[PDB]
Design an enzyme around this catalytic site. Sequence first.
Site, PDB file in Angstrom:
ATOM      1  N   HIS A  63      43.638 -39.555  68.432  1.00 43.48           N
ATOM      2  CA  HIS A  63      43.343 -40.536  67.586  1.00 43.48           C
ATOM      3  C   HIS A  63      44.127 -41.604  67.892  1.00 43.48           C
ATOM      4  O   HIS A  63      44.095 -42.916  67.255  1.00 43.48           O
ATOM      5  CB  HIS A  63      43.512 -40.341  66.052  1.00 43.48           C
ATOM      6  CG  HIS A  63      44.959 -40.289  65.573  1.00 43.48           C
ATOM      7  ND1 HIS A  63      45.767 -38.842  65.452  1.00 43.48           N
ATOM      8  CD2 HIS A  63      45.858 -41.123  64.996  1.00 43.48           C
ATOM      9  CE1 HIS A  63      46.847 -39.174  64.853  1.00 43.48           C
ATOM     10  NE2 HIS A  63      47.029 -40.448  64.675  1.00 43.48           N
ATOM     11  N   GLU A 119      63.000 -42.939  77.430  1.00 37.48           N
ATOM     12  CA  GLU A 119      63.322 -43.865  76.283  1.00 37.48           C
ATOM     13  C   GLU A 119      64.153 -43.084  75.329  1.00 37.48           C
ATOM     14  O   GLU A 119      64.042 -42.135  74.927  1.00 37.48           O
ATOM     15  CB  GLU A 119      62.180 -44.350  75.590  1.00 37.48           C
ATOM     16  CG  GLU A 119      62.104 -45.469  74.643  1.00 37.48           C
ATOM     17  CD  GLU A 119      62.775 -46.831  75.106  1.00 37.48           C
ATOM     18  OE1 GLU A 119      64.080 -46.981  75.266  1.00 37.48           O
ATOM     19  OE2 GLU A 119      62.169 -47.727  75.533  1.00 37.48           O
ATOM     20  N   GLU A 157      67.141 -51.466  72.940  1.00 33.50           N
ATOM     21  CA  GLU A 157      68.176 -51.660  74.023  1.00 33.50           C
ATOM     22  C   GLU A 157      67.743 -51.098  75.424  1.00 33.50           C
ATOM     23  O   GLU A 157      66.692 -50.177  75.355  1.00 33.50           O
ATOM     24  CB  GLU A 157      69.466 -50.880  73.749  1.00 33.50           C
ATOM     25  CG  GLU A 157      70.085 -51.262  72.275  1.00 33.50           C
ATOM     26  CD  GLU A 157      71.306 -50.833  71.971  1.00 33.50           C
ATOM     27  OE1 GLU A 157      72.083 -51.083  70.940  1.00 33.50           O
ATOM     28  OE2 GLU A 157      71.844 -49.642  72.916  1.00 33.50           O
ATOM     29  N   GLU A 163      68.445 -48.639  78.329  1.00 35.46           N
ATOM     30  CA  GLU A 163      69.413 -47.251  78.876  1.00 35.46           C
ATOM     31  C   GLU A 163      69.489 -47.295  80.368  1.00 35.46           C
ATOM     32  O   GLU A 163      70.230 -46.350  80.958  1.00 35.46           O
ATOM     33  CB  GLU A 163      68.842 -46.109  78.374  1.00 35.46           C
ATOM     34  CG  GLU A 163      69.012 -45.958  76.767  1.00 35.46           C
ATOM     35  CD  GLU A 163      68.000 -46.756  75.979  1.00 35.46           C
ATOM     36  OE1 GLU A 163      67.039 -46.368  75.808  1.00 35.46           O
ATOM     37  OE2 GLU A 163      68.369 -48.088  75.644  1.00 35.46           O
ATOM     38  N   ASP A 178      42.420 -33.153  67.942  1.00 33.52           N
ATOM     39  CA  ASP A 178      43.127 -34.241  67.934  1.00 33.52           C
ATOM     40  C   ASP A 178      43.998 -34.143  68.996  1.00 33.52           C
ATOM     41  O   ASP A 178      45.212 -34.075  68.995  1.00 33.52           O
ATOM     42  CB  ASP A 178      43.857 -34.476  66.669  1.00 33.52           C
ATOM     43  CG  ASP A 178      44.301 -36.085  66.863  1.00 33.52           C
ATOM     44  OD1 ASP A 178      43.962 -36.896  67.473  1.00 33.52           O
ATOM     45  OD2 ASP A 178      45.335 -36.408  65.720  1.00 33.52           O
ATOM     46  N   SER A 212      52.608 -39.459  65.585  1.00 31.35           N
ATOM     47  CA  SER A 212      51.474 -39.000  66.100  1.00 31.35           C
ATOM     48  C   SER A 212      51.292 -38.850  67.542  1.00 31.35           C
ATOM     49  O   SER A 212      51.723 -39.714  68.375  1.00 31.35           O
ATOM     50  CB  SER A 212      50.526 -39.722  65.500  1.00 31.35           C
ATOM     51  OG  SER A 212      50.146 -39.720  64.120  1.00 31.35           O
TER      52      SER A 212
HETATM   53  C1  LIG Z   1      44.845 -45.419  58.767  1.00 29.68           C
HETATM   54  O1  LIG Z   1      46.409 -45.431  58.543  1.00 29.68           O
HETATM   55  C2  LIG Z   1      46.920 -44.279  58.950  1.00 29.68           C
HETATM   56  C3  LIG Z   1      48.289 -43.975  58.157  1.00 29.68           C
HETATM   57  C4  LIG Z   1      49.172 -42.809  58.643  1.00 29.68           C
HETATM   58  C5  LIG Z   1      48.801 -41.943  59.486  1.00 29.68           C
HETATM   59  C6  LIG Z   1      49.247 -40.861  59.614  1.00 29.68           C
HETATM   60  C7  LIG Z   1      49.791 -40.472  60.896  1.00 29.68           C
HETATM   61  C8  LIG Z   1      50.764 -39.365  61.013  1.00 29.68           C
HETATM   62  C9  LIG Z   1      51.345 -38.692  59.994  1.00 29.68           C
HETATM   63  S1  LIG Z   1      52.247 -37.520  60.005  1.00 29.68           S
HETATM   64  C10 LIG Z   1      52.215 -37.287  58.137  1.00 29.68           C
HETATM   65  C11 LIG Z   1      53.042 -36.379  57.614  1.00 29.68           C
HETATM   66  N1  LIG Z   1      53.050 -36.410  56.088  1.00 29.68           N
HETATM   67  N2  LIG Z   1      53.769 -35.409  58.158  1.00 29.68           N
HETATM   68  C12 LIG Z   1      51.591 -38.319  57.876  1.00 29.68           C
HETATM   69  C13 LIG Z   1      51.036 -39.073  58.763  1.00 29.68           C
HETATM   70  C14 LIG Z   1      50.075 -40.089  58.560  1.00 29.68           C
HETATM   71  C15 LIG Z   1      47.358 -42.207  60.034  1.00 29.68           C
HETATM   72  C16 LIG Z   1      46.631 -43.339  59.756  1.00 29.68           C
HETATM   73  O2  LIG Z   1      45.347 -43.553  60.456  1.00 29.68           O
HETATM   74  C17 LIG Z   1      45.023 -43.265  61.936  1.00 29.68           C
HETATM   75 CA   LIG Z   2      65.647 -48.181  75.658  1.00 25.05          CA
END
Ligand SMILES: COc1ccc(-c2ccc3sc(C(N)N)cc3c2)cc1OC
Ligand SMILES: [Ca+2]
EC number: 3.4.21.22
Lengths: 235, 57
Positions: free
Chosen positions: A41, A55, A60, A62, A89, A185
């Site tokens: 995604h 990173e 900054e 490094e 995913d 993500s």
């Molecule tokens: C469209 O907006 C978005 C908003 C948020 C997320 C998204 C991505 C990663 C994680 S981990 C997590 C957790 N509660 N651990 C909640 C959450 C929400 C994805 C989206 O779309 C791809």
């Molecule tokens: Ca850096």
Amino acid sequence: VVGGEDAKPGQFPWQVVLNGKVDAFCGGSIVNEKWIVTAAHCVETGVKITVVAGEHNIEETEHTEQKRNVIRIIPHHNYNAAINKYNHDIALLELDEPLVLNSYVTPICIADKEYTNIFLKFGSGYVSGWGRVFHKGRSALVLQYLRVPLVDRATCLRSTKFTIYNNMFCAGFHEGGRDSCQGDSGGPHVTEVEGTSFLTGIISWGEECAMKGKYGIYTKVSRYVNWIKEKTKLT
Amino acid sequence: MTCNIKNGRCEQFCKNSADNKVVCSCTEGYRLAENQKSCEPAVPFPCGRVSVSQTSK
Ligand SMILES: COc1ccc(-c2ccc3sc(C(N)N)cc3c2)cc1OC
Ligand SMILES: [Ca+2]
Ligand SMILES: COc1ccc(-c2ccc3sc(C(N)N)cc3c2)cc1OC
């Protein structure tokens, strides 16, 4: 990552950050000098997406950072076979030029299907990223990490209206307050075994981060280890 | 010995073999020690290990 702590430099040397039309929009992990594993995604589009390995602090310098262009993106063939599920995913990114492995740029180990699952079932892994530090809030400057407990499948099923597939798992705290979040993500869920870390999940999705009774949802890497190995061979 | 109990004492991977079981193995970048259980780095930067000093001050 909500409620985590600053990593130290070189603590998660397999961690990378993805930049594009937005900076630090997703994480990933180093499979080898030429290949990153992330969430599909994250990379449904490819316009100059760049990977930064080594990173630590995003604002900054490094002098450990290695920036690379992505030349090829392979989402799992079954990702988006079903609309808006986030099933399967996971995606692979091929870099234009090899990374130079050093103390700050090191691959994550990937075991076979059987042992990745064993390691997952150990029940405690680490999650890291520069994602939001509060739900609907700002992004992290210094890399964050958090130990998350594995959550039993029946609990996780009851925690959300959304479908959780056999290719996913849940992790987090029953009380909430500490969690992965958006921006994290694609980054690594890893299990350390006698000082060696193995990839056990991909940070995938969730509902409101750190909310009590909600959990982070992860791609079950064990299901995909054979595909990763097959795609990322070096010659 | 079986893989049942403490992973056959293998640092990484264990497979059961005829009766007197346990053959240990290691992931890429490691080699099985002469000790036949533990896993030794066979490359300069083996996967999954932290090599930057974490203890600073
Ligand atoms: C469209 O907006 C978005 C908003 C948020 C997320 C998204 C991505 C990663 C994680 S981990 C997590 C957790 N509660 N651990 C909640 C959450 C929400 C994805 C989206 O779309 C791809
Ligand atoms: Ca850096
Ligand atoms: C405002 O609360 C939230 C509500 C929903 C979501 C959210 C984000 C991404 C995905 S992917 C998915 C799926 N696989 N069905 C379900 C779902 C839900 C995130 C939120 O905050 C971070």
